[PDB]
Design a protein around this ligand. Structure first.
Ligand SMILES: *[C@@H]1O[C@H](CO)[C@@H](O[C@@H]2O[C@H](CO)[C@@H](O[C@@H]3O[C@H](CO[C@H]4O[C@H](CO)[C@@H](O)[C@H](O)[C@@H]4O)[C@@H](O)[C@H](O[C@H]4O[C@H](CO)[C@@H](O)[C@H](O)[C@@H]4O)[C@@H]3O)[C@H](O)[C@H]2NC(C)=O)[C@H](O)[C@H]1NC(C)=O
Ligand SMILES: *[C@@H]1O[C@H](CO)[C@@H](O[C@@H]2O[C@H](CO)[C@@H](O[C@@H]3O[C@H](CO[C@H]4O[C@H](CO)[C@@H](O)[C@H](O)[C@@H]4O)[C@@H](O)[C@H](O[C@H]4O[C@H](CO)[C@@H](O)[C@H](O)[C@@H]4O)[C@@H]3O)[C@H](O)[C@H]2NC(C)=O)[C@H](O)[C@H]1NC(C)=O
Ligand SMILES: *[C@@H]1O[C@H](CO)[C@@H](O[C@@H]2O[C@H](CO)[C@@H](O[C@@H]3O[C@H](CO)[C@@H](O)[C@H](O)[C@@H]3O)[C@H](O)[C@H]2NC(C)=O)[C@H](O)[C@H]1NC(C)=O
Ligand SMILES: *[C@@H]1O[C@H](CO)[C@@H](O[C@@H]2O[C@H](CO)[C@@H](O[C@@H]3O[C@H](CO)[C@@H](O)[C@H](O)[C@@H]3O)[C@H](O)[C@H]2NC(C)=O)[C@H](O)[C@H]1NC(C)=O
Ligand SMILES: *[C@@H]1O[C@H](CO[C@@H]2O[C@@H](C)[C@@H](O)[C@@H](O)[C@@H]2O)[C@@H](O[C@@H]2O[C@H](CO)[C@@H](O)[C@H](O)[C@H]2NC(C)=O)[C@H](O)[C@H]1NC(C)=O
Ligand SMILES: *[C@@H]1O[C@H](CO[C@@H]2O[C@@H](C)[C@@H](O)[C@@H](O)[C@@H]2O)[C@@H](O[C@@H]2O[C@H](CO)[C@@H](O)[C@H](O)[C@H]2NC(C)=O)[C@H](O)[C@H]1NC(C)=O
Ligand SMILES: *[C@@H]1O[C@H](CO)[C@@H](O[C@@H]2O[C@H](CO)[C@@H](O)[C@H](O)[C@H]2NC(C)=O)[C@H](O)[C@H]1NC(C)=O
Ligand SMILES: *[C@@H]1O[C@H](CO)[C@@H](O[C@@H]2O[C@H](CO)[C@@H](O)[C@H](O)[C@H]2NC(C)=O)[C@H](O)[C@H]1NC(C)=O
Ligand SMILES: *[C@@H]1O[C@H](CO)[C@@H](O)[C@H](O)[C@H]1NC(C)=O
Ligand SMILES: *[C@@H]1O[C@H](CO)[C@@H](O)[C@H](O)[C@H]1NC(C)=O
Ligand SMILES: *[C@@H]1O[C@H](CO)[C@@H](O)[C@H](O)[C@H]1NC(C)=O
Ligand SMILES: *[C@@H]1O[C@H](CO)[C@@H](O)[C@H](O)[C@H]1NC(C)=O
Ligand SMILES: *[C@@H]1O[C@H](CO)[C@@H](O)[C@H](O)[C@H]1NC(C)=O
Ligand SMILES: *[C@@H]1O[C@H](CO)[C@@H](O)[C@H](O)[C@H]1NC(C)=O
Ligand SMILES: [Ca+2]
Ligand SMILES: [Ca+2]
Ligand SMILES: [Cl-]
Ligand SMILES: [Cl-]
Ligand SMILES: [Zn+2]
Ligand SMILES: [Zn+2]
Ligand SMILES: [Zn+2]
Ligand SMILES: [Zn+2]
Lengths: 696, 696
């Protein structure tokens, strides 16, 4: 039989391993020849594997690269102008790769050029609350200072925005061992820890969903009219550069001024973690000088788009997408994901060669330039937005398959919760001690839901990956799954070798998943989801799961507002409309679910009508006007946090209107905007509910 | 049989007449008790007629009314402050209505309050080009002057915007006999001409599609958070008041200053039509004083929404909508339309009682507050936008059935051209001399297409009626039809008694359509369109008709740009991408049409897929970012003219970027914006084309 079991059984750990090796021998930086060659290889193989069509979709987007003959570095300079200490020009390459060409040195993509010189201020993680502590409690002014911040906790782009708004004239990002060196584990190549010379690459844009900085709203095609650089979206205004902890220790060790305000500001290096500004007495006339010469250049990128046409509903699309471009070798990010997508395509193709087709069309994507701001996925979605919003059933992301080896991680829309629970009950656990038990059982034991006994944790989608356009701009049901580390010891900074040269095939094969069993499990989850979405007669979405979370989110936002009882009285701030909308949603969803299981099974129009109601439910949460000053974040329930792009925020319009409201000079205006956002949210919830009512 | 002929044959002239009489005995001003009572009557009758459900949908919107105890008027004052001439407080009521209560006196809805006093400047029709002539050629400065403008040629709201931007401190609008007195015809009640005491009411907003000024984007429901009056959309900043030509003659007769620049500035009164400013020597110390005391007030309005549920595709909506509110009796506007809708509902209901149902759901609407800015239709569409954009097949408007008695007028989307041609070939002409001939034949003879022999004129949709939200915001295929006057003698100002107290049942029955045969013909056109849209197995849209007009519009916009050949060279302004998109659209549409007639007839999914492609084609022309500074005009092909809301403009983004471009101080910036709009238009055309490609 051609059923899900046939699909899942065809997936092989050994194939995933072979593909990962194949994808990680040379760098595949976006916009480079080697990443174009890999695109062409993937296109050719997907055709061989049996897809109906496989095309490249190219765009010309703004990218950023160091200058090969004018390297980026940071100095400590003395009062004479002599550079007495210089940061490294490159990470020491790992064993057997010391002759590999075209390893991009560490840099912060999209940094402007400059050679600012000044006194350091240490700003912890450069979070909003870190800057509050500096400016409001400690009275330290970052204006005209070079800030040094440790990576971790939030997306690095947010750190840069925060530093820029504090008046910094440059930013130095570094990896502290407190956040990137797990105790008792050896540095690469002898274990999975970050060495002192290791450096995390990564873009520092604040795009808010825009895609290519020069073409917001429209694809960067061959006739596109581009913004000038001065009107581009999301570019930082001050130079930024990342360093390792050997070099950071040399910058931090001389710091003077105020002591750290408490132990949450101290990392693990043998330095005091003084805030500054500037150095202690003997070194007070020394300064820090950045030298950044990177350039921004419009560069061609290539997405591979494979189609497996549906037998019954070819105008309904289920999308499995993940990126191909990497900072260097991409051993985990993204090729551990891409290898999984490759094996999923191979398996689906094996069924297709035997005469099977899915009910709905499946689209497979290998995205480019994800590392430079989700550019390839977003430009393609901009080009195809009309097709996607009328025909898009679901988007399953497929970046890194592993960030640890402890248990499963799933982030998705509530519409997929039931699907994920049911699928994981039918999959085998790969975990030690759970032989013969389901993945649902091991996952639930290791990552219990904070709210329901006997259920696993599923998180909100944040951002920082290629699902963003699909979910928060277009309102297509989206999800992601991978293996992760223990949620208890999880400090929200990722794996130590993230975006480092040390992220290699050997890292994965030696230290993460030698048998490729966690990769296989992730392939079964991502592939099983795509299979069920593309083949189930009734779309596998449960609207009642949205009703439950909406009440939880309404309770949460009300509880934030209720810290200001006087103001709620003065300005007559009521959440009654939102709770009423949520109650209505709950009632209407329950009645829709009854019809979905009571409806005449033999009637395909009632079926297609009900499937369209399910499909367009996520879509109903889109507000075409967007969120305030973030026109491409249109989902009213979920947006990336304004303080941390990686984190999802619920009722973001209301949350941002309430945030730090006690510091606003015009409380009448501020609370008026809270009330406006309550109205928008209540209306949107009710409108969404009404899409599930009887249609006439 | 229950076919279209059964539906059309059930329609009766005598019923339309009875309904028109019933709807026009008392005023039905939006927000008044009498218009609520008529809503309830219509609801009750639509239920009796056989609709499945009939509900009122209410909203609380900003309306505007005169002050009953502090009347609006204009004076000529002398240097002592004595008011030596006053304009009328009311129109002399027509015979037999001199005791009717609650006739709203003439006023300009949404005028602010004020008592400005100054010198008059006569500005012709207050069009953009009239103000160019004054300011650029004649060097007359309107700053701080009261402007007097004749009604006609463009929407009065545009006149007010133009006067405000010229620095006027008030506007007086009047009806010149040149524009509202047809030679050889008697004044009401002895014919259909405007008497000297007659006055045209009407709003002077510039909403650009926003709906209720206080709640742009969201319905004005019971928990709506409203803008303050200072941030409301579209309100005029200077007082405005309308007068008749007896009173205008008294204001114009003393005008001095410059002579009119040519005969196109002279109306038909026995005055010189001097531009001013101010009066001739003997009267130079006299001034004009306005006294406006109208108030803006949030007021409840009521739409009636009737549903006839579809038998096969109940989740597909065909909407027949027209307004109910009137300025006074509404003898033509809107009740000649509403009477037709009422008879259409009755006919459909007669078929329903015999066991028939349409294939798709039909929605019938009686909109409120159309006269105050399309408020009722727009708030309802805002509430139901998610349902409408996923399920809306088409919108047929049904305001005034007659503006003359010469021939048919149709304005619609190109998608409906074929439908209209085919339907009118099957309907009888009601015209004298065409007994036994088709309506298509009489219409084609009297109103020939300017472009194709043997075809009739069909215009672009402009705005100024309730289709605006459906078409230019939401992208639902829309159309309108009525009887009109001769296109040759048509001076684009409407019928003389427009928005006057004299617009009565007797006007219609005595002078326009004594046998109600033109009303019956319009009922057959509007109803026949709704019938075909709601019942045809394949939606009756021909995408190839869009391809033809797109080429015509591309040719037109290119020819505007080519008046500036040097600048096109300097700034490398190419229309190649737009022409390429149009060519592609043409090719893809032709191939889609072949599939639509070659497709497996027995396959309902291929049918529903192809019907969805047809339905969503209009939708594909929507840009979610809107047009520049007009976020609710989202259709890229068609928007209301920035100079005249009544007129449709093609490729409006490009047109407005080119308009008066030679006067822009930064030509590089101006031509850059032309190129940006070309890119947007070419992309949108191509994207629309791609929705008609094979889906996978
Ligand atoms: C969750 O779902 C429920 C439905 O179960 C919605 O309930 C509606 O709530 C609104 C707001 O409370 C109600 O609004 C009231 O409508 C009254 C008239 O209702 C009749 O007529 C209308 C059409 O005109 C019909 O739709 C309806 O079925 C009734 O037959 C008005 O008279 C009320 O206004 C008066 O009171 C208010 C408040 O004191 C004053 O401000 C006004 O000035 C005026 O005096 C009021 O507008 C509506 O009737 C309810 N519909 C029902 C029960 O079907 C919830 O709104 C929904 N939640 C959300 C967030 O949408
Ligand atoms: C109307 O419909 C036609 C299709 O019939 C569209 O034609 C496309 O037009 C674009 C723009 O001219 C073509 O773009 C070119 O693509 C080349 C590569 O194409 C191959 O590979 C791609 C995927 O990467 C496939 O999609 C394609 O089938 C081909 O196999 C590029 O190499 C070209 O770039 C080079 O030349 C340009 C111009 O000199 C330079 O600026 C570049 O730097 C570079 O040197 C170019 O990008 C595209 O191939 C055409 N598709 C076809 C024929 O299928 C029209 O675009 C469409 N009109 C509109 C308005 O959309
Ligand atoms: C995940 O798995 C659960 C458990 O199997 C699925 O829920 C079950 O769905 C079936 C099929 O719709 C339900 O069966 C129905 O039972 C009613 C009587 O109660 C009957 O009238 C119908 O004809 C039908 O047989 C079953 O009740 C339901 N079980 C539950 C909720 O416990 C669930 O749908 C799956 N989720 C997906 C596919 O997303
Ligand atoms: C308006 O009326 C015209 C004329 O009747 C309609 O066009 C006609 O549509 C029919 C039905 O699709 C076409 O018939 C087809 O002919 C081809 C062979 O040429 C055959 O393969 C198909 O099976 C089918 O019989 C007919 O050609 C076509 N005539 C034309 C274009 O002259 C038109 O569709 C109507 N418009 C609407 C409903 O909007
Ligand atoms: C720190 O580096 C500076 C600059 O050196 C250049 O850039 C480096 C990153 C690397 O590419 C070097 O090979 C380049 O010379 C050194 O300062 C320079 O020293 C040279 C030789 O003494 C002198 O002629 C230059 O003028 C200096 N340039 C500047 C800008 O000061 C410096 O010696 C290095 N410091 C240490 C401690 O190694
Ligand atoms: C023009 O009207 C003014 C104002 O009259 C008032 O408003 C009118 C529209 C109407 O409602 C009148 O009944 C009101 O009295 C006249 O000027 C007033 O004249 C009265 C009586 O002589 C005097 O006491 C008031 O102070 C005047 N008010 C003002 C504002 O000047 C004026 O006489 C009328 N002119 C003509 C030619 O009829
Ligand atoms: C990755 O795998 C691909 C596919 O097997 C290899 O590319 C093939 O290489 C052979 C031998 O050079 C050629 O004859 C084929 O044409 C290639 N097939 C393609 C591109 O589809 C590639 O060499 C492998 N890369 C590494 C680093 O092992
Ligand atoms: C317009 O027609 C309606 C419907 O026939 C009339 O309203 C009815 O009036 C009778 C007699 O007063 C009542 O018994 C009915 O209840 C009414 N029916 C309704 C409201 O559905 C109304 O009188 C007519 N108006 C005019 C001006 O003739
Ligand atoms: C890179 O730096 C070199 C030499 O220091 C300079 O000549 C060149 O212009 C720079 N390249 C770019 C792309 O800016
Ligand atoms: C920070 O520093 C600059 C002066 O260099 C000043 O303009 C700014 O206002 C200071 N801010 C505070 C809060 O002291
Ligand atoms: C892989 O799993 C083992 C078993 O607990 C663990 O000791 C090892 O550290 C894990 N690897 C990573 C990279 O976490
Ligand atoms: C209308 O005018 C009267 C008397 O001239 C005044 O008392 C009243 O306030 C005004 N009404 C409104 C609604 O402004
Ligand atoms: C028109 O009048 C005012 C002075 O009352 C002046 O400010 C304005 O610039 C004048 N405009 C022109 C074009 O003369
Ligand atoms: C109605 O038609 C007749 C016939 O041409 C014409 O004389 C009369 O003026 C028409 N009525 C109107 C209002 O145009
Ligand atoms: Ca773009
Ligand atoms: Ca509104
Ligand atoms: Cl992922
Ligand atoms: Cl109309
Ligand atoms: Zn990645
Ligand atoms: Zn990454
Ligand atoms: Zn009207
Ligand atoms: Zn009107």
């Amino acid at each position: 039989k051609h059923n899900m079991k046939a699909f899942l059984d065809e997936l092989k750990a050994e194939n995933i391993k072979k593909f990962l090796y194949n994808f990680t021998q040379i760098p595949h930086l976006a916009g480079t020849e080697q990443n174009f060659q890999l695109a062409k290889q993937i296109q050719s193989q997907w055709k061989e594997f049996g897809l109906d069509s496989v095309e490249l979709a190219h765009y010309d987007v703004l990218l950023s690269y160091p200058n090969k003959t004018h390297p980026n570095y940071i100095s400590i300079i003395n009062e004479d102008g002599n550079e007495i200490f210089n940061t490294s020009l490159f990470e020491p390459p790992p064993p057997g790769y010391e002759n590999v060409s075209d390893i991009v040195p560490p840099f912060s993509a999209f940094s402007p050029q400059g050679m600012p010189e000044g006194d350091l201020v240490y700003v912890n993680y450069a979070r909003t609350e870190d800057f509050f502590k500096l400016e409001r409690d400690m009275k330290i002014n970052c204006s005209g200072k070079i800030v040094i911040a440790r990576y971790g906790k939030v997306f690095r782009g947010n750190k840069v925005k925060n530093a820029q708004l504090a008046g910094a004239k440059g930013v130095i990002l570094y990896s502290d061992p407190a956040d990137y060196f797990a105790p008792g584990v050896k540095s690469y190549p002898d274990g999975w820890n970050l060495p002192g010379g290791g450096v995390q690459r990564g873009n520092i844009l604040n795009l808010n969903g825009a895609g290519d900085p020069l073409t917001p709203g429209y694809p960067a095609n061959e006739y596109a009219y581009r913004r000038g650089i001065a009107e581009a979206v999301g570019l930082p205004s001050i130079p930024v550069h990342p360093i390792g902890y050997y070099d950071a220790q040399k910058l931090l060790e001389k710091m003077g001024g105020s002591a750290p305000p408490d132990s949450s500001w101290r990392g693990s290096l043998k330095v005091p973690y003084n805030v500054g500004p500037g150095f202690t007495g003997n070194f007070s006339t020394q300064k820090v000088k950045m030298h950044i010469h990177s350039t921004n250049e419009v560069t061609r990128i290539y997405n591979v788009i494979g189609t497996l046409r549906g037998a019954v509903e070819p105008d309904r699309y289920v999308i499995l997408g993940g990126h191909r471009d990497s900072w260097v070798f991409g051993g985990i990010d993204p090729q551990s994901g891409a290898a999984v997508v490759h094996e999923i395509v191979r398996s689906f193709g094996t069924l297709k060669k035997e005469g099977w087709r899915p009910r709905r069309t499946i689209l497979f994507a290998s995205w480019d330039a994800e590392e430079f701001g989700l550019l390839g996925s977003t430009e393609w979605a901009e080009e195809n937005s009309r097709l996607l919003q009328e025909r898009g059933v679901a988007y399953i992301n497929a970046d890194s398959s592993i960030e640890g080896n402890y248990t499963l991680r799933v982030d998705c829309t509530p519409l997929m919760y039931s699907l994920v629970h049911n699928l994981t009950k039918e999959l085998k656990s790969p975990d030690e001690g759970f032989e013969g038990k389901s993945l649902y059982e091991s996952w639930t034991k290791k990552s219990p839901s904070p709210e329901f006994s006997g259920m696993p944790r599923i998180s909100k989608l944040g951002s920082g990956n290629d699902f963003e356009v699909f979910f928060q701009r277009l309102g297509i049901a989206s999800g992601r799954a991978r293996y992760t580390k223990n949620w208890e010891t999880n400090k929200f900074s990722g794996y130590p070798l993230y975006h480092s040269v040390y992220e290699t095939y050997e890292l994965v094969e030696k230290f993460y998943d030698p048998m490729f069993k966690y990769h296989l499990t992730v392939a079964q989850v991502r592939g099983g989801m795509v299979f069920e979405l593309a083949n189930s007669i009734v779309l596998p979405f449960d609207c009642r799961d949205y009703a439950v979370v909406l009440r939880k989110y309404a309770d949460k936002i009300y509880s934030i507002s209720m810290k200001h009882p006087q103001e709620m009285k003065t300005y007559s701030v009521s959440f009654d409309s939102l709770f009423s909308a949520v109650k209505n949603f709950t009632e209407i969803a329950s009645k829709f679910s009854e019809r979905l299981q009571d409806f005449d099974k033999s009637n395909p129009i009632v079926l297609r009508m009900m499937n369209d109601q399910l499909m367009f439910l996520e879509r109903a949460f889109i507000d075409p006007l967007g969120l305030p000053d973030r026109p491409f974040y249109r989902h009213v329930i979920y947006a990336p946090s304004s303080h941390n792009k990686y984190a999802g925020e619920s009722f973001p319009g209301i949350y941002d209107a309430l945030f730090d409201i006690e510091s606003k000079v015009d409380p009448s205006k501020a609370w008026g905007e809270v009330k406006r956002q309550i109205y928008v949210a209540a209306f949107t919830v009710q409108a969404a509910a009404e899409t599930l009512s009887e249609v006439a």
